[PDB]
Design a protein around this ligand. Structure first.
Ligand code: HEM
Ligand SMILES: O=C1N[C@@H](Cc2c[nH]c3ccccc23)C(=O)N2CCC[C@@H]12
Ligand SMILES: O=C1N[C@@H](Cc2c[nH]c3ccccc23)C(=O)N2CCC[C@@H]12
Ligand SMILES: [Mg+2]
Length: 396
C-alpha cells in the first residue's frame, strides 16, 4: 500500500511517521517507491531498540548487492563490494576506526576545529551585510573535517568532485538512475587513481591510518583503499554538512534557547544531544535483513526480508520523549537515536559531536544571529538521503 519514502525533504516530518507509530502493530508493511520491494518499517522507540540490538537482523546483508532496498539504485560502482566497514572487518581493522575516530582523534583535532569554527563565525560577524551559513560556514567547516580527519589533503576541485558524487548518488529522486550509478562509478574511479597518494599526504587522517595499519594479510591494496575512500565520503561528508545546516536552522528558530547557552556555556553539551534528537537528518531509514525467520514483538519476518527503522520517527516517539516536537536542551529523557543503536552506533559520533559542539558554541557566543529571510522562504534540496537546505541566509 503505502510507498516509501515519504517525500518530507524539509524539516517538517511526514505525518505518516506518527500515523504508523500510533497503529496497533509494532512493524508496518510498506513498498519501496524506487524498486517495488516490500519492506517493513518500525517507528516506535521500544521496538527499534529491540530490533537494532538483535544481530540476527543484519546490516551487512541489507547492504549487499541484491538485497531488497529502499534506494532506487544500488549504492555502489557496478561489480564492487562497496561495504567499507565489512572490508575493515575482513582486514581485522575494525579497531582502527577507534584510533582515527575515537577520543584520541578528538584530542588531536578539537583545537583546530574550534579555532576554525570561531574564525569563520568571526569573519561573518565582521561583514557589513548578510551572508549564507550553509556556503560560508558549513561548507568550509565540513570540508576541513573531511580532509583533515578522513581523506587527507584535497584540492578544491577534488572536494567539489566528491561532494557532487555524494549529492548525486545518495538520492531517492531528482536524478536519473543512470546518473546515480555514474556518481558511484566516478567516485570509485577517483579513489582507484588517488587513494594511495591521499593516504600519503601529511596529517593523521583516517585513510592514512588505514593504509598504515598492521594487517595479518598484506598491508591493504589500492582496491581496498578505494573501498575505504568511498565509505568515508558517503558516511562523513553529506551527513555532517546536512546535520550542521539543520542544527543551525534549529538554533536560529530558538533564540530563547541560544540565550540560555550564551549565559551558561556548561549547558552546551546537553544542547548538542538534544539537537541530535530533534533535528531530522535522513529522509530514509536504517535497515537490516532478517537472516532467518524471526519475530519482532509478535510480527513474523521471513528470512531475507528487510526491516527499516526511521530514526526521525523514533526520536519523536511521545512514549519515549515528553513533548517530542519541542526543542528542549534541558530534557531528561532516554538516549536519542541520532547516531543509531547497538553494534552499529555511528563510529563517527565523537568527531561529529566535537564539530557540532564547536558550531553551537560559535553561535552561542554571539547573540543576535538570525535568519535573514522568513523560515518558509528556506529552499530545500529535494530527494537527498540527507536533508540539506540550498542556503541559510543570515545576519546580525
Ligand atoms: C552529524 C553527523 C553524523 C550523523 C548524524 C551520523 C549518523 C550515523 C548513524 C545513525 C549511523 C547508523 C546507521 C545504521 O544503523 O545502519 C551511522 C553509521 C556510520 N557512521 Fe555516522 N554519522 C555522522 C557523521 C559521521 C562521520 C563524520 C563519520 C566518519 C567516517 C561517520 C562514519 C560512520 C560509519 C563508518 C558508519 C557505519 C557503521 C556501521 O555500519 O557499523 N559518521 N552514522
Ligand atoms: O557502513 C555502512 N553502513 C550502512 C548505513 C550507512 C551509514 N552511513 C551511510 C551513508 C549513506 C548510506 C548509508 C549509510 C549502509 O547502508 N552503507 C552503504 C554505504 C555506507 C554503509
Ligand atoms: O537515507 C539513508 N539512511 C541510511 C541509514 C541512516 C539513517 N539515518 C542516518 C544518519 C546518518 C547516516 C546514515 C543514516 C541508510 O541506510 N540508507 C540506504 C539508502 C537510504 C540511506
Ligand atoms: Mg535479493
Amino acid at each position: 500500500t503505502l510507498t516509501y519514502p515519504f517525500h518530507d525533504w524539509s524539516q517538517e516530518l511526514s505525518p505518516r511517521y506518527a500515523q504508523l507509530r500510533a497503529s496497533d502493530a509494532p512493524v508496518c508493511p510498506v513498498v519501496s517507491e524506487g524498486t517495488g520491494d516490500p519492506l517493513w518499517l518500525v517507528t516506535r522507540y521500544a521496538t527499534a531498540v529491540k530490533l537494532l540490538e538483535d544481530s540476527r537482523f543484519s546490516s551487512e546483508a541489507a547492504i549487499a548487492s541484491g538485497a531488497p532496498r529502499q534506494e532506487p539504485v544500488e549504492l555502489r560502482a557496478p561489480g564492487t563490494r562497496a561495504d567499507g566497514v565489512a572490508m575493515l572487518r575482513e582486514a581485522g581493522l575494525r579497531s582502527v576506526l577507534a584510533d582515527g575516530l575515537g577520543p584520541r582523534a578528538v584530542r588531536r583535532h578539537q583545537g583546530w576545529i574550534n579555532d576554525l569554527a570561531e574564525t569563520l563565525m568571526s569573519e561573518l560577524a565582521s561583514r557589513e551585510g548578510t551572508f549564507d551559513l550553509a556556503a560560508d560556514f558549513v561548507e568550509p567547516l565540513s570540508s576541513a573535517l573531511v580532509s583533515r580527519t578522513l581523506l587527507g589533503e584535497l584540492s578544491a576541485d577534488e572536494r567539489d568532485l566528491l561532494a557532487h558524487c555524494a549529492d548525486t548518488g545518495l538520492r531517492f529522486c531528482g536524478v536519473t538512475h543512470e546518473e546515480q550509478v555514474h556518481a558511484f562509478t566516478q567516485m570509485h574511479e577517483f579513489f582507484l587513481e588517488h587513494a594511495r597518494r591521499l593516504a600519503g599526504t601529511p596529517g593523521e587522517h583516517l585513510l592514512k591510518l588505514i593504509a598504515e595499519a598492521p594487517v595479518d594479510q598484506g598491508p591493504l591494496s589500492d582496491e581496498a583503499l578505494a573501498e575505504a575512500g568511498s565509505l568515508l565520503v558517503v558516511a562523513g561528508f553529506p551527513t555532517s554538512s546536512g546535520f550542521l545546516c539543520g542544527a543551525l536552522l534549529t538554533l536560529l528558530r530558538h533564540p530563547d534557547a541560544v540565550q540560555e547557552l550564551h549565559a551558561h556555556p556548561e549547558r552546551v553539551p546537553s544542547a548538542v544531544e538534544e539537537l541530535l534528537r530533534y533535528t531530522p537528518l535522513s529522509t530514509g531509514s536504517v535497515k537490516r535483513m532478517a537472516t532467518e525467520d524471526l519475530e519482532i514483538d509478535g510480527v513474523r519476518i521471513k528470512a531475507g526480508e528487510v526491516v527499516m527503522v526511521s530514526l526521525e520517527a523514533v526520536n519523536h516517539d511521545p512514549d519515549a520523549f515528553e513533548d517530542p516536537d519541542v526543542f528542549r536542551p534541558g530534557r531528561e529523557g532516554p538516549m536519542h537515536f541520532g547516531f543509531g543503536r547497538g553494534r552499529h552506533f555511528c563510529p563517527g559520533n565523537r568527531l561529529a559531536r566535537c564539530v557540532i559542539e564547536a558550531t553551537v558554541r560559535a553561535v552561542a557566543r554571539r547573540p543576535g544571529l538570525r535568519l535573514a529571510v522568513a523560515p518558509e522562504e528556506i529552499s530545500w534540496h529535494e530527494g537527498l538521503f540527507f536533508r540539506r537546505p540550498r542556503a541559510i541566509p543570515a545576519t546580525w
